[PDB]
Design an enzyme around this catalytic site. Structure first.
Site, short mmCIF file in Angstrom:
data_model
loop_
_atom_site.label_atom_id
_atom_site.label_comp_id
_atom_site.label_asym_id
_atom_site.label_seq_id
_atom_site.Cartn_x
_atom_site.Cartn_y
_atom_site.Cartn_z
N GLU A 1 -62.50 91.59 54.78
CA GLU A 1 -61.41 90.96 54.03
C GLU A 1 -61.92 89.74 53.24
O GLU A 1 -61.59 89.58 52.07
CB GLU A 1 -60.28 90.57 54.97
CG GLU A 1 -59.13 89.86 54.28
CD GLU A 1 -58.35 90.77 53.34
OE1 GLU A 1 -58.35 92.02 53.56
OE2 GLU A 1 -57.74 90.22 52.38
N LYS B 1 -63.96 90.83 50.23
CA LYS B 1 -63.16 91.39 49.13
C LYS B 1 -62.58 90.26 48.27
O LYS B 1 -62.63 90.32 47.04
CB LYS B 1 -62.05 92.30 49.66
CG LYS B 1 -62.57 93.66 50.12
CD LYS B 1 -61.44 94.64 50.43
CE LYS B 1 -60.58 94.15 51.59
NZ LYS B 1 -59.63 95.23 52.04
N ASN B 2 -62.04 89.24 48.93
CA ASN B 2 -61.50 88.09 48.21
C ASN B 2 -62.58 87.34 47.44
O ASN B 2 -62.40 87.00 46.27
CB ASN B 2 -60.77 87.14 49.16
CG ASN B 2 -59.44 87.71 49.64
OD1 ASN B 2 -58.43 87.64 48.94
ND2 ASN B 2 -59.44 88.26 50.84
N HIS C 1 -63.81 93.47 60.49
CA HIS C 1 -62.52 93.37 59.80
C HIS C 1 -62.37 92.04 59.06
O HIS C 1 -62.00 92.00 57.89
CB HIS C 1 -61.36 93.57 60.80
CG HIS C 1 -60.01 93.64 60.17
ND1 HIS C 1 -59.35 92.52 59.69
CD2 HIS C 1 -59.19 94.69 59.93
CE1 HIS C 1 -58.18 92.89 59.19
NE2 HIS C 1 -58.06 94.19 59.32
#
Ligand SMILES: O=S(=O)(c1ccc(O)cc1O)N1Cc2cc(O)cc(O)c2C1
Ligand SMILES: O=S(=O)(c1ccc(O)cc1O)N1Cc2cc(O)cc(O)c2C1
Lengths: 363, 363
Positions: free
Chosen positions: B236, B239-240, B232
């Site tokens: 994240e 993606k950033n 998780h």
């Protein structure tokens, strides 16, 4: 002929310090007209700044306040305040007033020269006399950050006045360089740190510098800043990075270099110093900025210099590998505004804490 | 046949949650004897955890508490607490008790599936209905960190029970992998992030991974952890990092890779993700962890997962260049202890703040 110090302290502590920007400092002239204005400004502003911080000293735990070194520093602040009170009724039009004022500021600066290690002796006296406790420790940490930042700001005001109104670089405005070449300061700090590292270890890591000028890739990076403050921060960072590198490589003849990146963005001028000195676990990072554990205030004072003009100094390590330290500065002189603690309800509330279980679980 | 919910809430809120270590979770067996012990433990511990956080919900500003979505989430917690109260007088020796208990926990988990975005709708309702104010905002930030961490811990307890006592990897203990290959999780997260980046931008940065196993340079880095939580956080972050890289390189066909270092030290297992996506000014970093400004709770929830077992997730950018994100985890299962908020005087005091001038100067 002066009133008792408490009467002045109460009077001036009612005002808030007035933060100035780097651009405001820079735009201040050197004429007789400008000297009178500096005088009339500083005979109000310096007492406001002295009184505000003196009021917070009184909020310290009795234990810390009772130490001889803290009482000594307090007595210096009192005398310095009184020295300026002598000027309240003096005529700015009289040249002797102005010259006497500059002499008084020099005397104050000298009086306070040893404030940092004297306060550190106070902390040690507290620890030795009473033993330390977590509540007092948190209060000390909170107070000292504010006290030392206050002191930085008072010294800035005094240095600007004495430098301007009383040279190596005539292009500087007091202690401010409107065209500070950041990489040159990096190199100066590295050179001095290398002298020390070579003395003790007979070797030191090489330096590599890379610049990233986002908007103008070819242009060397410059800024408006106080080079001595920048030098101070970089020198402390280099000493730590060098020691880590050499000590973590006892067996090697080849040392990894210290790599510095200077980046210029729209808002930030950021300087990263990267070492491969083996790092430190996250748990131990906070200690590096602690006045208690390090009682060697090099790192916490360096971070205050960064914070003073709205910047910061941050450490992130990778245990087993090395550590990155980043100095964040404002790129623009208009964003570079003094960060000054103020005595008020909010401040007062921080010293009003007590011992109890935390808001998080323990096994 | 049950008492009113407030009577149970008051009763169980008097206890503190009991934090368990990763090693304790791991050492728990799967026998009928172990299932009875889990039952008798959880029919006390789950009510303690539910009650503690419900008590803090009540400290929120009337404005936030008055929103329909917050009231909805509150009603779910009440029903879940009551569901467990049905088991207080039940015999653990009766197999039907145990099977019914597992069914009840599954029903609770399902009921609460949408808690995160439902609370986010509450925040939006507050902003829409009243407008936001800084005091409420600080309270919301403080509360939500604790509320969502609480929720993570409750889901951990429930998942461990249902997974163990009711497979792809039989070597896992519930959701825990005693031999989690960190680089494999990094690669899995990268792969999934790349699918999304490729869909929208028709390109994505490559991945480079480097491992530093300080004590054992040749050995692949493994740890005891919950791989889904690690996945998780990394997903994240990727993606950033990918979005930054592609968007800052609109003109280029060559994209700088995302570089990941996995370091294993004596105490920390640290994972750094480095991008050259142009970065962000320091001023804007805090916003990334804000529930308000980002009302997309990906980053703040990711940091909570890191904090849950005594780790952290930290961002440091260089505006004009790029950003480093670091996940800090405990290397040892014995150091990996649940971080649980508790309802007490200290907690209660945080919601007791009001509007006033800060302890720092403004021009
Ligand atoms: O904490 S460090 O990572 C560190 C702290 C601050 C900094 O600016 C740079 C650093 O590498 N470092 C590791 C280590 C090992 C030593 O043997 C001796 C040292 O002085 C140190 C210092
Ligand atoms: O804040 S960033 O530096 C950043 C934040 C978090 C993180 O994990 C990595 C990052 O690079 N980043 C810059 C940027 C530019 C864009 O055009 C689009 C983005 O999503 C972003 C995100």
């Amino acid at each position: 002929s002066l009133a008792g110090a408490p009467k002045y302290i109460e009077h001036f502590s009612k005002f808030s310090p007035s933060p100035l920007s780097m651009k405001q400092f820079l735009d201040f002239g050197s004429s007789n007209a400008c000297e009178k204005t500096s005088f009339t400004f500083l005979r109000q502003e310096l007492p406001v700044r002295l009184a505000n911080i003196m009021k917070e000293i009184n909020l310290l735990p009795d234990r810390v306040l009772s130490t001889p070194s803290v009482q000594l520093v307090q007595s210096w602040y009192v005398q310095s305040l009184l020295d300026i009170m002598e000027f309240l009724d003096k005529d700015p039009e009289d040249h002797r007033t102005l010259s006497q004022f500059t002499d008084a500021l020099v005397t104050i600066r000298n009086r306070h020269n040893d404030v940092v290690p004297t306060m550190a002796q106070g902390v040690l006296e507290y620890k030795d006399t009473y033993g330390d406790d977590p509540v007092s420790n948190q209060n000390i940490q909170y107070f000292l950050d504010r006290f030392y930042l206050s002191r930085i700001s008072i010294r800035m005001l005094i240095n600007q006045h004495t430098l301007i109104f009383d040279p190596a670089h005539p292009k500087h405005i007091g202690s401010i360089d409107p065209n500070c070449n950041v990489s040159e300061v990096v190199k100066d700090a590295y050179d001095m740190a290398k002298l020390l590292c070579d003395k003790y270890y007979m070797a030191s890591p090489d330096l590599e510098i890379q610049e990233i000028n986002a908007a103008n890739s070819k242009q060397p990076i410059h800024m408006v800043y106080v080079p001595s403050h920048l030098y101070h921060m970089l020198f402390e960072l280099f000493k730590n990075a060098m020691r880590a590198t050499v000590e973590s490589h006892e067996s090697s003849l080849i040392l990894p270099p210290i790599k510095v990146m200077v980046a210029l963005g729209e808002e930030d001028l950021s300087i990263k110093m990267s070492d491969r000195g083996g790092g430190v676990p996250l748990r131990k990072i906070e200690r590096l900025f602690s006045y208690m554990y390090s009682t060697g205030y090099g790192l916490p004072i360096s971070r205050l210099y960064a914070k003073y003009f709205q910047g910061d100094l941050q450490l992130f390590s990778m245990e087993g590998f090395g550590t990155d330290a980043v100095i964040y500065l404002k790129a623009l002189s208009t964003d570079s505004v003094e960060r000054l603690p103020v005595y008020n309800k909010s401040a007062w509330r921080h010293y009003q804490t007590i011992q109890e279980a935390g808001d998080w679980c323990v096994p």
